[PDB]
Amino acid sequence: VARGWKRKCPLFGKGG
């Protein structure tokens, strides 16, 4: 459930 990575930085694959 870490789609926030596609938002700004793809490094958010962990968080979201």
Give the CA distances from residue 9 to residues 1, 2, in Å, rounded to whole numbers and listed in that order. 15, 11
Task: Please give the method by which this entry was determined.
Answer: NMR
C-alpha–C-alpha distance, residues 10 and 15, integer Å: 10
Q: Report residue 16 as tokens.
A: 């979201």
16: closest CA among 7, 6, 2, 8? Answer: 2
